[PDB]
């Protein structure tokens, strides 16, 4: 849950209650700043998480020799200069989907054929 800090004293904003009006307010507990809530959702604790992620591409990935080159045509620029690798979420279950970094426009196409991502 996106969490805001205040101005000036720059600190953690803790949610307190507005009794007389029935609404939620974040406040600083070393200063005297208080502000309204942009949402009613205060705390989230994910257990079963849906995840499947790429890498930290610096675009300089093309400038690393130890990365393999396949030969698919990139969806947009059509250059057969790809470099690929598996999902960087190195968890035990995650699958063997290859991610292709087009060395011409830095587009990221996959090998997947069951689902779809704009990620």
């Amino acid at each position: 849950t996106t969490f805001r800090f205040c101005r000036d004293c720059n600190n953690m904003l803790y949610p307190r209650e507005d009794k007389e009006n029935n609404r939620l307010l974040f406040e600083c507990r070393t200063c005297s700043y208080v502000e309204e809530a942009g949402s009613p959702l205060v705390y989230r604790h994910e257990l079963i998480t849906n995840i499947g992620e790429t890498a930290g591409v610096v675009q300089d990935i093309g400038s690393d020799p130890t990365l393999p080159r396949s030969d698919r045509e990139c969806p947009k620029c059509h250059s057969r200069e790809n470099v690929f690798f598996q999902s960087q979420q190195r968890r035990k279950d995650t699958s063997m989907v290859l991610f292709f970094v087009c060395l011409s426009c830095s587009h990221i196409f996959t090998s997947d054929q069951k689902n779809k991502r704009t990620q």
Binding site: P15, E17, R23, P40, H45, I48
Partner: protein
Amino acid sequence: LEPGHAADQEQAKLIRSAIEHTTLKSVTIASEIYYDPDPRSTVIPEDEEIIQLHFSLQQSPWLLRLELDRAAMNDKDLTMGQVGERIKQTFKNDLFVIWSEDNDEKLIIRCRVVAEEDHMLKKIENTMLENITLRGVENIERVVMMK
């Protein structure tokens, strides 16, 4: 298995779901905490359909939302009622508990509490996990079937 019902596939996954230590923690997806002030209409518009029922037929504003997964909830044969009836009899008649049904796009268990009540709503956040059994014997995690 019992002499007779030993070669029955489904029969096997019925006993399975009665031995495996199934906690509320096993089926839970996300445990959220909302500031819902008027306990007669939910702030969340994906819940509106729920309250209509549990009113048609004095507490506190700090709501505690729980999303259960349909998938896990049918490996170990359970239904929303059974889940909800279990929490409501752990803290008994001092935690306002409600739950959806088995035909909504998303299952939800909404409960409210009854002088720092945001700090007592986490004492109880942990009990609703590592101290609550649904159906199964304790210490028996994972139960595999084999022919």
